[PDB]
Design an enzyme around this catalytic site. Structure first.
Site, mmCIF file in Angstrom:
data_model
loop_
_atom_site.group_PDB
_atom_site.id
_atom_site.type_symbol
_atom_site.label_atom_id
_atom_site.label_comp_id
_atom_site.label_asym_id
_atom_site.label_seq_id
_atom_site.Cartn_x
_atom_site.Cartn_y
_atom_site.Cartn_z
ATOM 1 C CB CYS A 217 -0.970 -0.001 1.179
ATOM 2 S SG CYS A 217 -2.484 -0.919 0.838
ATOM 3 C CG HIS A 218 0.620 3.888 1.828
ATOM 4 N ND1 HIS A 218 -0.077 3.797 3.011
ATOM 5 C CD2 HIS A 218 -0.305 4.117 0.862
ATOM 6 C CE1 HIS A 218 -1.369 3.929 2.769
ATOM 7 N NE2 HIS A 218 -1.534 4.127 1.473
ATOM 8 N N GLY A 219 4.417 1.009 0.764
ATOM 9 C CA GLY A 219 5.815 0.627 0.669
ATOM 10 C C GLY A 219 6.614 0.524 1.952
ATOM 11 C CB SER A 220 5.800 -0.295 5.423
ATOM 12 O OG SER A 220 5.368 1.024 5.700
#
Ligand SMILES: CCCCCCCCCCCCCCCCCC(=O)OC[C@H](COP(=O)([O-])OCC(O)COP(=O)([O-])OC[C@@H](COC(=O)CCCCCCCCCCCCCCCCC)OC(=O)CCCCCCCCCCCCCCCCC)OC(=O)CCCCCCCCCCCCCCCCC
Ligand SMILES: CCCCCCCCCCCCCCCCCC(=O)OC[C@H](COP(=O)([O-])OCC(O)COP(=O)([O-])OC[C@@H](COC(=O)CCCCCCCCCCCCCCCCC)OC(=O)CCCCCCCCCCCCCCCCC)OC(=O)CCCCCCCCCCCCCCCCC
Ligand SMILES: CCCCCCCCCCCCCCCCCC(=O)OC[C@H](COP(=O)([O-])OCC[N+](C)(C)C)OC(=O)CCCCCCCCCCCCCCCCC
Ligand SMILES: CCCCCCCCCCCCCCCCCC(=O)OC[C@H](COP(=O)([O-])OCC[N+](C)(C)C)OC(=O)CCCCCCCCCCCCCCCCC
Ligand SMILES: CCCCCCCCCCCCCCCCCC(=O)OC[C@H](COP(=O)(O)OCCN)OC(=O)CCCCCCCCCCCCCCCCC
Ligand SMILES: CCCCCCCCCCCCCCCCCC(=O)OC[C@H](COP(=O)(O)OCCN)OC(=O)CCCCCCCCCCCCCCCCC
Ligand SMILES: CCCCCCCCCCCCCCCCCC(=O)OC[C@H](COP(=O)(O)OCCN)OC(=O)CCCCCCCCCCCCCCCCC
Ligand code: HEC
Ligand code: HEM
Ligand code: HEM
Ligand code: FES
Lengths: 237, 379, 98, 54, 56, 52, 65, 74, 54
Positions: free
Chosen positions: D18-21
């Site tokens: 989703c946001h690249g963690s």
């Protein structure tokens, strides 16, 4: 990432509709290419009647496949020829069998696959006609195939659509671009079994409101002309 | 011997409501949205009924039943997409209504304005639950993300989530629960709308000029009924264009995928009419602060009548406040755009700037502008 | 200088185009309503007619010709003394209740 | 809350889409926004391997 | 004038007005449906399952 | 607003209504603890804590 | 049997924008392959070339099927 | 708040005309167009600048995203 | 009597009848203790979902 180009589909027009002979070819390519691994359980052989196949033809197609029907008198599951009301056969019994079959990957259901992907048909077309060798540097994991249009740039699918993959009854050359074109039109129809009627109702709405709106506007102006022509006068003593 | 129009009880109420009610003469088109809301509500109450007549509420038959309505029910797809896009029409009319009330200083009607804020909250909650109903990927994951905010509430917060979830995650219990709540709520909205019309009628509408128009009043029936009919025709034009030509324009394609809790979609965005607030949520790293700003983004309308400092009521004769108001509208549009894009450079900093500017404009810039404004006119 | 800015603002406000005077555009709170009631008859009649003409013009989305625009210098201040007195009386009442 | 994919990514532990963690193959962060480590349940070992999670 | 005679015959009485509306709707349904179907069919000539069913 | 409500007799009225308002707040606190069954507080009242 | 898609492919690649993408990708290929160990993967230039070629082929092609 | 006791107005005379004796679209373009032009001219200087600023921010942010998603020579 | 009746069902009636709406969990605290319910449940073999092989 790489998005799909806007191909000029015969149905991309505002009032345009699908090419039903292309739908007829698309059902054939679905049945003889991706029916082995993909499921379209939301649609049924009944829907095929009168859109791209006739009643008897759809019945013959249903009789060609065999499906599972509820237990007999002895309480045993059994096979029977499919009729016009059965849904499209599911190639795999349970989704886990599907994932384990190909390579730990579940082939998505194609029933809504056009409206479930940002880009619609243009994507899936570019998906099928987009297979290419990896660029220098990529170390694709074994068992995967490179497809730039697929997010992740690594499809688990194998290239399904090569030349002469099948024999269209019309006699149109079953070249890769052709076969992909009809499969994508068929997929659009499967995802939207209203596209024909939607545009017809929209056309009726346009040519009907085009006279309804000016008329109601004229009625409003007629009623309000009592006030809009009011001429005030102030006459103090 | 009397009119049954103005002597029969129900007919008397109808007459005083929208037949012989004194309305301002110079009411602009921006007021039509009032009725355009109610009509939408009626439509939303109508089509939803015919949806609940072919919609189960179990997680094993939610998506399948929706596809059944779309593909098999005779003309069912018309109703389904009419609901889905009439929700967007409802929210467009709602936002334009709030903007009208803000611009022309209609918030001086304190009771009606507060009732409107309550209606806004109720409509937003109902739409959220409705979008949860079809059990798509967007549905399930947006529901999880939105409900997980309540875990930020101190002490009780976690329990509250487990209460609303009816368990440990959005699951079978929550789907049916949201179905029941989405069914009941619009009737509460209708009751509140009736109360709202009552409160507004106790004072009368406000004209664009912002000045009392008790001298130039016209009967409602011969004029504003046909004006509202024209407004309804235009709104039906827009809504029918949306449904018939491009139904999946305002939606998200990933919502056409069966909800799979073991995999999330590439992006988790809410419906469009919520993004303006979602971006504000994303502005503050402090989760509790994020939830508080989320609530305040709507509750600010409650404080708005207090902050009014200008001697004049409307914005017709306040050019500086006009530029401020359009700055606010552009800011809301910017937040809506920001909400869709992922949390990356430069959307993060732009989102923080937009969220700061929204409250700065509402709370500080507008009252100070009005204070300068009165001084510029000898008062 | 400042008065030039004020004149520019009066021109850009727009209530002159409608024939309105400054005081006709004021919001009618309780103090303003009582002040309007306190107005002499001759001023009140002109106030009502000016307001009604302005509402008519805004209904038809029009403005008066440039000649019949209330000039900045000719913008009298009729409601100001009565409103000031009403505010003074209210302030006295509040101070006594204090 | 986006569920990270299986053992892969930059280092190979995780990759939240989703946001690249990023998270290593221990729940521990090593890259990306990824505010904190992945939180571990109250696991209970039985005999052999049938761990009763929770 | 045609309009004057038409008004005197049909629009004067609200009952004749309603009857005129009803028969107008009856015939307008046919006329409009025929016209719209013809236009839609002409635009998409050869593509619907009515210009090709004859091939099967 | 706040200019008007800041007065000698206004603070005097506030003082008069301090007891009633404060023990209305106590009423609310006890009712909240009761209805919620707030175990954190109810563990210290002698008789009631026997319920848990 | 020849693919009309394939036939239009080289015609579309004979385009100034596609031409520029060609030597961009080729130079990237030399940079990546020549070095013994590098993660800098020419997917960006490949994507640019593909976007150019596919936007070209979208206008064509469909009037051959 | 019904007609009859709303306010007190004196010395005003209004003349009207039956809707059946006056046109419903009187010079819909002869004075419609100049009126529209005046209306938009007297409001564009206050309406446009915020949206034009938003358009600049939108395009700048989008191109910033695009050319920050590229590869960095390293 | 409930505890005895459950055994009567288990050994006699369960050969051909069923109470599909009743699970072993319900017996805890009414006719059997928790460990006894575990033992009762573990005496029988139930179908489960697909394996990694489907
Ligand atoms: C000139 C070209 C641009 C015209 C539109 C923008 C503009 O400057 O409008 C000024 C003006 C509207 O604002 P205004 O008259 O300065 O102020 C009064 C209010 O707008 C209220 O005036 P109204 O009650 O007559 O409503 C007019 C309004 C009607 O607006 C609506 O009905 C709501 C918006 C959705 C439609 O029409 C609009 O065009 C405004 C909204 C859309 C702007 C784009 O419209 C026109 O001059 C023409 C409008 C009709 C289209 C031609
Ligand atoms: C959410 C969005 C969808 C739903 C929105 C619904 C909003 C309400 C619409 C219905 C309604 O009550 O409209 C009343 C509202 C005002 O009534 P009106 O009879 O047009 O007022 C004309 C003025 O009195 C006199 O205006 P004028 O002095 O500029 O001369 C006539 C004309 C200018 O003459 C023209 O020919 C227009 C320019 C070409 O200007 C107009 O505003 C006429 C309509 C132009 C279109 O209607 C409009 O402004 C036009 C239709 C509104 C929608 C389109 C706006 C653009
Ligand atoms: C729900 C969501 C919103 C949906 C859209 C709502 C807006 C569209 C509907 C309204 C359109 C405008 C009004 C249309 C009706 C009308 O003209 O009313 C005024 C008109 C009156 O207009 P009039 O007063 O100008 O003409 C009548 C007077 N004489 C007789 C002298 C000419 O109403 C009628 O005429 C009523 C009687 C006739 C209509 C009813 C009976 C026949 C109905 C059809 C056949 C039976 C079925
Ligand atoms: C604030 C009001 C009390 C909230 C609360 O949790 O009270 C304790 C009681 C019982 O909880 P408890 O006393 O077992 O533990 C309280 C602390 N938490 C909730 C974090 C475990 O709460 C409830 O019964 C409902 C609380 C939510 C509704 C208020
Ligand atoms: C007022 C609301 C209606 C506004 C005007 C709508 C005009 C368009 C219209 O209704 O066209 C007809 C269309 C159905 O046309 P068709 O599919 O050919 O079926 C009828 C012939 N057998 O009708 C439809 O598609 C349905 C009617 C419009 C959508 C619903 C509107 C009310 C809610
Ligand atoms: C619509 C775009 C056109 C527009 O607004 O033009 C400006 C025009 C001016 O209207 P007028 O009442 O004449 O203003 C005083 C002029 N001296 O018209 C207006 O100012 C009317 C528009 C503002 C008031 C109505 C509310 C509109 C809200 C739009 C955004 C909604 C979402 C954000 C707010 C919540
Ligand atoms: C923008 C223009 C069109 C608006 C919508 C028109 C709806 C139908 C009525 C109509 O045609 O009106 C236009 C015109 C003038 O109509 P009106 O102003 O009522 O005057 C009638 C006597 N000449 O009347 C005509 O053109 C027909 C009669 C001559
Ligand atoms: C023998 C296996 C196999 C064949 C043949 C096959 N597929 Fe697939 N397909 C897969 C698998 C596995 C995936 C999952 C890839 C990822 O995940 C997939 C993915 C897809 C996707 C989704 C891609 C995405 O963006 O997620 C579509 C659409 C699709 N296939 C359509 C087709 C069509 C159309 C055909 C033939 C006309 C076809 N497939 C042939 C196995 C197959
Ligand atoms: C459920 C949705 C709503 C409905 C059905 C509704 C209904 C109405 C209607 C029909 C009117 C009269 C027409 C008009 O002036 O616009 C009105 C007026 C008003 N509404 Fe609403 N409304 C709704 C939401 C809201 C909201 C969210 C607010 C703001 C918080 C609000 C505040 C007002 C105000 C201030 C007025 C008076 C406008 C004026 O006098 O100029 N309403 N409402
Ligand atoms: C306040 C007005 C209402 C709004 C704003 C609203 C909004 C929504 C939304 C946004 C959805 C999801 C649409 C989608 O799937 O994309 C939905 C679905 C649904 N609503 Fe409503 N709704 C309203 C009133 C009602 C009412 C009164 C009912 C019951 C009679 C109802 C029943 C349903 C049902 C059954 C669904 C699921 C079908 C579907 O999602 O397509 N709605 N609603
Ligand atoms: S949700 Fe895990 S990084 Fe965006």
């Amino acid at each position: 990432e790489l998005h799909a180009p806007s191909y000029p589909w015969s149905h991309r027009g505002l009032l345009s509709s699908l090419d039903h002979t292309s739908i007829r070819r698309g059902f054939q390519v679905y049945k003889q290419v991706c029916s082995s691994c993909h499921s379209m359980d939301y649609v049924a052989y009944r829907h095929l009647v009168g859109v791209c196949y006739t009643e008897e033809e759809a019945k013959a197609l249903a009789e060609e496949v065999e499906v599972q029907d509820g237990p007999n008198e002895d309480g045993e599951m059994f096979m029977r020829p499919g009729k016009l009301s059965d849904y499209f056969p599911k190639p795999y019994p349970n989704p886990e069998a599907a994932r384990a079959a190909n390579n730990g990957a579940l082939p998505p259901d194609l029933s809504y696959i056009v409206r479930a992907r940002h880009g619609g048909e243009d994507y899936v077309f570019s998906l099928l006609t987009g297979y290419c060798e990896p660029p220098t540097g990529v170390s694709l994991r074994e068992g995967l195939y490179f497809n730039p249009y697929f997010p992740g740039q690594a499809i688990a699918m194998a290239p399904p659509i090569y030349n002469e993959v099948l024999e269209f009854d019309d006699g149109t050359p079953a070249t890769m671009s052709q076969v992909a074109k009809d499969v994508c039109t068929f997929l659009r129809w499967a995802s939207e079994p209203e596209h024909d009627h939607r545009k017809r109702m929209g056309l009726k709405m346009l040519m009907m409101m085009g006279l309804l709106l000016p008329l109601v506007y004229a009625m409003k102006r007629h009623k309000w002309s009592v006030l809009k022509s009011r001429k005030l006068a102030y006459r103090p003593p | 011997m009397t009119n049954i129009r103005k002597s029969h009880p129900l007919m008397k109420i109808i007459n005083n409501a929208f037949i012989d009610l004194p309305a301002p003469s110079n009411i602009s088109s921006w007021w039509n949205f009032g009725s355009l809301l109610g009509i939408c509500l009626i439509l939303q109450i109508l089509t939803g009924l015919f949806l609940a007549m072919h919609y189960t509420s179990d997680t094993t038959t939610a998506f399948s039943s929706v596809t059944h309505i779309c593909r098999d029910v005779n003309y069912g797809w018309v109703i389904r997409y009419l609901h889905a896009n009439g929700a967007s029409m409802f929210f467009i009319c709602l936002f334009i209504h709030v903007g009208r009330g803000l611009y022309y200083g209609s918030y001086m009607f304190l009771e009606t304005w507060n009732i409107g804020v309550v209606l806004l909250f109720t409509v937003m909650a109902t739409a959220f639950m409705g979008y949860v109903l079809p059990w798509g990927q967007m549905s399930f994951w947006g529901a999880t993300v939105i409900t997980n905010l309540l875990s930020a509430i101190p002490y009780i917060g976690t329990d509250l989530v487990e209460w609303i979830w009816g368990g440990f995650s959005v699951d079978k219990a929550t789907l049916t629960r949201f179905f029941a709540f989405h069914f009941i709520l619009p009737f509460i909205i209708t009751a509140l709308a009736a109360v709202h019309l009552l409160f507004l009628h106790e004072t009368g509408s406000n004209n664009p000029t912002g000045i009392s128009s008790d001298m130039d009043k016209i009967p409602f029936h011969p004029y504003y009924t046909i004006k509202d009919i024209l407004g309804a025709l235009f709104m039906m034009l827009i809504l029918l264009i949306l449904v018939l030509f491009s139904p999946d324009l305002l939606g998200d394609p990933d919502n056409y995928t069966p909800a799979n809790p073991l995999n999330t979609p590439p992006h988790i965005k809410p419906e469009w009419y919520f993004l303006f607030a979602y971006a504000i949520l994303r502005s503050i790293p402090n989760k509790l602060g994020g939830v508080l700003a989320l609530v305040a983004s709507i509750l600010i309308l409650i404080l708005m009548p207090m902050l009014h400092t200008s001697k004049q009521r409307s914005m017709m004769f306040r050019p500086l406040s006009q530029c401020l108001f359009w700055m606010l509208v552009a800011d809301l549009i910017t937040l809506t755009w920001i909400g869709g894009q992922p949390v990356e450079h430069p959307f993060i900093i732009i989102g923080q700037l937009a969220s700061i500017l929204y409250f700065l404009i509402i709370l500080v810039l507008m009252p100070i502008t009005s204070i300068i404004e009165n001084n510029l006119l000898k008062w | 200088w400042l008065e030039g800015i004020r004149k520019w603002y009066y021109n850009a406000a727009g209530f002159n185009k409608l024939g309105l005077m400054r005081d006709d555009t004021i919001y009618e709170d309780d103090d303003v309503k009582e002040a309007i009631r306190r107005l002499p008859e001759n001023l009140y009649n002109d106030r009502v007619f000016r307001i009604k003409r302005a509402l008519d013009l805004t209904m038809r989305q029009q403005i008066l010709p440039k000649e019949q625009w209330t000039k900045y210098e000719e913008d009298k201040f009729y409601l100001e003394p009565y409103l000031k007195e009403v505010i003074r009386e209210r302030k006295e009442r509040e101070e006594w209740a204090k | 809350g986006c569920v990270p994919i299986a053992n892969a990514g930059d280092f190979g532990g995780y990759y939240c889409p989703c946001h690249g963690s990023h998270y290593d193959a221990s729940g521990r962060i090593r890259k990306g926004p990824a505010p904190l480590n992945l939180e571990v349940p109250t696991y209970e070992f039985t005999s052999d391997d049938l761990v009763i999670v929770g | 004038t045609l309009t004057a005679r038409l008004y005197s015959l049909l629009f004067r009485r609200t009952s004749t007005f309603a009857l005129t509306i009803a028969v107008g709707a009856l015939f307008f349904e046919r006329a409009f449906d025929q016209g719209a179907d013809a236009i839609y069919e002409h635009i998409n000539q050869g593509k619907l399952w009515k210009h090709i069913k004859h091939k099967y | 607003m706040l200019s008007r409500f800041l007065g000698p007799r206004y603070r005097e009225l506030a003082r008069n209504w301090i007891p009633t308002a404060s023990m209305w707040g106590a009423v609310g606190a006890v009712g909240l603890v009761w209805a919620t069954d707030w175990r954190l507080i109810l563990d210290w009242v002698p008789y009631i804590n026997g319920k848990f | 049997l020849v693919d009309p898609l394939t036939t239009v492919r080289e015609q579309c690649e004979q385009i100034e924008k596609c031409i520029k993408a060609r030597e961009r990708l080729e130079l990237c290929d030399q940079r990546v392959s020549s070095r013994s160990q590098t993660e800098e993967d020419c997917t960006e230039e490949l994507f640019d070339f593909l976007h150019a070629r596919d936007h070209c082929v979208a206008h064509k092609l469909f009037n051959s099927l | 708040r019904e007609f009859g006791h709303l306010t007190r107005m004196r010395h005003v005379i209004t003349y009207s005309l039956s809707p059946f004796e006056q046109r419903a679209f009187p010079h819909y373009f002869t004075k419609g167009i100049p009126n529209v032009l005046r209306r938009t001219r007297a409001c564009i200087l206050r309406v446009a600048p915020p949206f034009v600023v938003f358009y600049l921010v939108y395009t700048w942010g989008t191109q910033e995203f695009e050319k920050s998603k590229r590869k960095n020579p390293a």
